[PDB]
Ligand binder design. Structure first.
Ligand SMILES: CC(=O)N[C@H]1[C@H](OCCc2ccc3occc3c2)O[C@H](CO)[C@@H](O)[C@@H]1O
Length: 512
């Protein structure tokens, strides 16, 4: 694909990927690059940095305020009042001012902008966070946190109960709890009333309370999370903690009857002798249609249609893609069409894995389901490719250096035979070092380096009252934390479907 042919395709991650491939091979001229940002679907990350090596962006200063950016710290007392207040939006700018000018500006703004006054006078002290905390200036607190994560102080009951109302609270709490940073802030958040938090925030504050062995407070946070979470899977995670902490058999019963298939509902079913959930069986009689499963642009087009289809148009697409060749697209349509109530666990292109042992089959299928939903031309925002979502660098390492496949190109990752073969190859490497399918999943998504560093820690996946569940909540990268739980659920299901059942309690025992 030349740039001229790509420019005729609709904007998509597939088009972005192929533009990025031209940039990385130096095939986009300064002239070609002129109109190109209107041809880019998601102008973020590597494609933006490559394009900008060809054409810098000067942009962008609102023309109304351009004059404001002609002043510096040395000349800002010469600027009009609007210019002064625009430049004081930046804490680095405030930090750069001399203290006499901070005093002058704080007086200027005391009436109309006491927020600015508070920050100016804060930066005249040796600890601006202490000054902002004494004022109980909530917007000021978050500005200072965004400026520097190194500030740490005890916060009283009144102040900590005010923080949840700010949009920044959820990321603040998640970051400091998961990274085990800012211990005075962490300890302070034990005094947050569960009435003042909900959803993710409540849940994280439950995890926080567990780490300080405040189990009654933890229960109260998790109960609030369960009552407020929008997604049944998250509610189930919260109910599981309620159960682990207080052992009310009604909580375990509710969890065992969940409509969501996740590790918590599966565990609860096992503990209560409840039958394994019903898994749909898709067996289209029609063998093919016209659709090209190897065309990445055709997938981008049909995906967009499927995601914008009303209740009625989903039924039309379901029928058209109800074939063996388009089974992954069929299951994808059904999963949306049935409002995520039915469990679809397909095994496409099965001839490529049927000679592996069943435990290995299940792990491959579990990874593919979460990575791609088995869509052969799946492309991620980071341009991971195909059913097993290989990053180009690893794909080329395996395909060119290790396997020495003649005329190998990274786009071979769109072929199911190649995806499953490479997937098996990398999963062999990972499993030989890590053993547990949960740890393998963490390493598949996050890398073996991150996984090894986590497992080297004294506080992760060791013995303990709430282990290994607590450790699973504290995996320090959110994408990997979530991924491991999903892949582990899938693994249990596929082992069951292949007549190679394992108890999820055995998996959990082997994590410690
Ligand atoms: C295609 C894609 O973006 N896949 C994602 C995947 O996205 C969720 C599943 C998925 C599958 C097929 C899809 O086709 C269009 C969007 C999409 C998302 O998330 C994983 C992390 O949990 C990533 O490792 C993986 O690269």
């Amino acid at each position: 694909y030349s740039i001229e042919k790509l420019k005729k395709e609709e904007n998509s991650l597939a088009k972005d990927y192929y533009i990025y491939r031209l940039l990385e091979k130096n095939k986009i001229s300064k002239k070609d690059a002129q109109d190109l940002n209107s041809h880019i679907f998601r102008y973020i990350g590597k494609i933006k940095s490559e394009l900008e090596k060809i054409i810098p962006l000067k942009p962008y200063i609102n023309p109304k305020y351009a004059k404001c950016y002609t002043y510096t710290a040395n000349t800002i007392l010469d600027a009009n009042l609007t210019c002064q207040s625009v430049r004081l939006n930046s804490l680095v700018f405030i930090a750069s001012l001399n203290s006499k000018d901070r005093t002058t500006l704080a007086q200027t703004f005391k009436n109309q902008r006491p927020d600015l006054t508070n920050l100016l006078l804060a930066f005249n002290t040796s600890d601006p966070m202490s000054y902002i905390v004494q004022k109980e200036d909530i917007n000021g607190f978050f500005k200072l946190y965004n400026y520097s994560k190194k500030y740490d102080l005890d916060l009283n009951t009144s102040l900590v109960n005010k923080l949840p109302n700010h949009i920044g609270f959820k990321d603040f709490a998640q970051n400091i709890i998961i990274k085990k940073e800012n211990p005075k802030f962490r300890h302070s958040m034990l005094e947050i009333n569960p009435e003042n938090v909900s959803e993710d925030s409540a849940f994280y504050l439950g995890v926080n309370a567990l780490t300080y062995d405040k189990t009654e407070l933890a229960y109260d946070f998790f109960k609030k999370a369960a009552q407020s979470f929008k997604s049944q899977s998250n509610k189930d995670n919260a109910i599981f903690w309620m159960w682990l902490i207080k052992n009310n058999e009604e909580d375990l019963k509710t969890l065992s009857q969940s409509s969501s298939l996740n590790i918590y509902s599966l565990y609860a079913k096992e503990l209560t002798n409840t039958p394994f959930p019903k898994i749909e069986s898709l067996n289209p009689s029609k063998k093919k249609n016209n659709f090209n499963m190897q065309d990445p642009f055709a997938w981008q087009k049909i995906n967009k249609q499927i995601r914008d289809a009303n209740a009625s148009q989903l039924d039309v697409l379901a029928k058209e893609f109800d074939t063996q060749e388009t089974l992954p697209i069929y299951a994808y349509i059904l999963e949306r069409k049935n409002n995520f109530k039915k469990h679809y666990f397909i095994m496409p292109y099965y001839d490529n894995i049927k000679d592996y042992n069943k435990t290995r089959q299940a792990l491959i299928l579990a990874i593919a389901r979460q990575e791609s939903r088995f869509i052969p031309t799946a492309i991620s925002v980071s341009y991971a490719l195909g059913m097993m979502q290989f990053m180009p660098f690893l794909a080329n390492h395996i395909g060119e250096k290790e396997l020495k496949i003649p005329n190998f190109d990274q786009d071979f990752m769109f072929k199911p035979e190649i995806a499953y073969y490479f997937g098996n190859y990398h999963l062999n490497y990972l499993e030989s070092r890590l053993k547990s399918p949960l740890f393998v999943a963490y390493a598949y998504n996050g890398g073996i380096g991150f996984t090894n560093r986590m497992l080297a820690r004294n506080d992760m996946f060791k013995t303990g009252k709430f282990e290994p569940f607590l450790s699973m909540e504290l995996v320090p990268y959110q994408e990997s934390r979530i991924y491991g739980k999903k892949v582990l659920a899938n693994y249990i299901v596929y082992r069951h479907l292949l007549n190679d059942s394992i108890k999820i309690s055995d998996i959990f025992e082997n994590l410690i």
